[PDB]
Amino acid sequence: EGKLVIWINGDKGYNGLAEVGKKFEKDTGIKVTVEHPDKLEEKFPQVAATGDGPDIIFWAHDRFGGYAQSGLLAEITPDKAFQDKLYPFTWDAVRYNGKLIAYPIAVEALSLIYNKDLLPNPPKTWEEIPALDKELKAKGKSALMFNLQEPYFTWPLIAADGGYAFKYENGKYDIKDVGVDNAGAKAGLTFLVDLIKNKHMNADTDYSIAEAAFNKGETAMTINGPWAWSNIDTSKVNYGVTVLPTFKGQPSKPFVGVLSAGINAASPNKELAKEFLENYLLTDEGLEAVNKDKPLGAVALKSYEEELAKDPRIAATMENAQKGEIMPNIPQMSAFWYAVRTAVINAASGRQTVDEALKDGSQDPRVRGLYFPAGGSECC
Numbered sequence: 001e002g003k004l005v006i007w008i009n010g011d012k013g014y015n016g017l018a019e020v021g022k023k024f025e026k027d028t029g030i031k032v033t034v035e036h037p038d039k040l041e042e043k044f045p046q047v048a049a050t051g052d053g054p055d056i057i058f059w060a061h062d063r064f065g066g067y068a069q070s071g072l073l074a075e076i077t078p079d080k081a082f083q084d085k086l087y088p089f090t091w092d093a094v095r096y097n098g099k100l101i102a103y104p105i106a107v108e109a110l111s112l113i114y115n116k117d118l119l120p121n122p123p124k125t126w127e128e129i130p131a132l133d134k135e136l137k138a139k140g141k142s143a144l145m146f147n148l149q150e151p152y153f154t155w156p157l158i159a160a161d162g163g164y165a166f167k168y169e170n171g172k173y174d175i176k177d178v179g180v181d182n183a184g185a186k187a188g189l190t191f192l193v194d195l196i197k198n199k200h201m202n203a204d205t206d207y208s209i210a211e212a213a214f215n216k217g218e219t220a221m222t223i224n225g226p227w228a229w230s231n232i233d234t235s236k237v238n239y240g241v242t243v244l245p246t247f248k249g250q251p252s253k254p255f256v257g258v259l260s261a262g263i264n265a266a267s268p269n270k271e272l273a274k275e276f277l278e279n280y281l282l283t284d285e286g287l288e289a290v291n292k293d294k295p296l297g298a299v300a301l302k303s304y305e306e307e308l309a310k311d312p313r314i315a316a317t318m319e320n321a322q323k324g325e326i327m328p329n330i331p332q333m334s335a336f337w338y339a340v341r342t343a344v345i346n347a348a349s350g351r352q353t354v355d356e357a358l359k360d361g362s363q364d365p366r367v368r369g370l371y372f373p374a375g376g377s378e379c380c
């Protein structure tokens with residue numbers, strides 16, 4: 001209280017955000033403290049539940065509907081003049097049940113990043129990668145290496161030929177109809193597991209192992225968001241950001257996320273938070289500070305977006321974003337991501353078959369909302 005504590009994921013520009021916090025503290029005298037706890041996405045509703053935590057919380061829009069549903073976030077009330085400074089579709093990203101629950105920051109989408117030196121020409125397809133790997137393995141390199149621990153990175157493939165989260169119908173998602181176990185999704189996950197079985201990829205490659213490999217030039221390509229371009233710029237690797245490879249002739253459909261800023265409902269500093277977000281962060285000068293630390297992607301602020309338009313990397317992010325679809329923000333998104341995280345890993349580690357893994361994934365009661373027991377509640 002009387003100050004501002006912000007939580008932002010560790011892969012974002014928290015130091016750039018901290019710089020905005022000093023500009024604020026210089027004007028208001030209010031100390032802004034930026035933090036980046038591990039697993040904050042799930043640590044937040046754990047603490048905020050007890051009326052504890054940060055005043056402002058950053059994270060992609062998909063989790064906000066759940067927080068909103070449990071009364072963990074304060075309703076946003078920007079003046080119409082301010083609302084017109086951001087792109088309309090980004091406001092809809094953070095609109096839960098008709099009420100605004102967060103401030104949009106930037107549009108994010110996964111892209112295919114490759115080393116122009118080892119791979120002067122990026123694979124047009126997913127199918128030609130195993131052939132490309134063997135070529136490079138011979139030279140002592142790899143063709144592809146990305147974070148397999150988070151289904152956010154593997155989804156583009158699973159969705160390319162047909163997989164989907166929830167069936168959007170009648171202006172509303174259907175939680176009983178999940179499409180993670182359909183033919184298109186199985187086709188996609190199967191392909192990824194074959195890569196693993198054929199020793200093209202490691203089942204346990206995470207974000208850091210992958211990043212290090214690409215940055216040190218030990219692998220030809222990687223799949224990552226805009227925030228990753230900074231470490232690569234410093235690694236001095238000659239890279240390129242381009243469209244994700246297609247699968248079965250169908251483009252990869254990543255789940256587009258809108259970086260959002262939400263105010264803790266139990267926050268005494270609500271009006272302070274509003275001043276910081278609207279008057280200091282969401283400005284050309286504010287966004288820049290952050291961007292310079294670690295690129296946001298395609299910022300929602302119209303004024304600063306026009307400047308970022310001339311960046312070829314941003315253009316590619318936009319192309320990939322166009323082929324995918326914005327993540328739903330329904331309360332069930334957390335259960336879904338977990339169900340899929342489990343299925344992808346079970347399938348990847350051979351603990352389960354793809355058909356078995358995905359099936360159990362679409363039947364998770366935590367996503368469906370119900371369960372039909374074999375017997376019932378009684379006793380004889």
Ligand SMILES: OC[C@H]1O[C@H](O[C@H]2[C@H](O)[C@@H](O)[C@H](O)O[C@@H]2CO)[C@H](O)[C@@H](O)[C@@H]1O
Binds near residue numbers: 151257
């Ligand atoms: O792996 C499932 C998670 O995917 C997304 O998380 C993204 C986030 O949108 C993005 O801003 C950040 O840079 O990367 C993470 C993936 O590590 C969802 O938004 C999460 O809710 C899911 O748990």
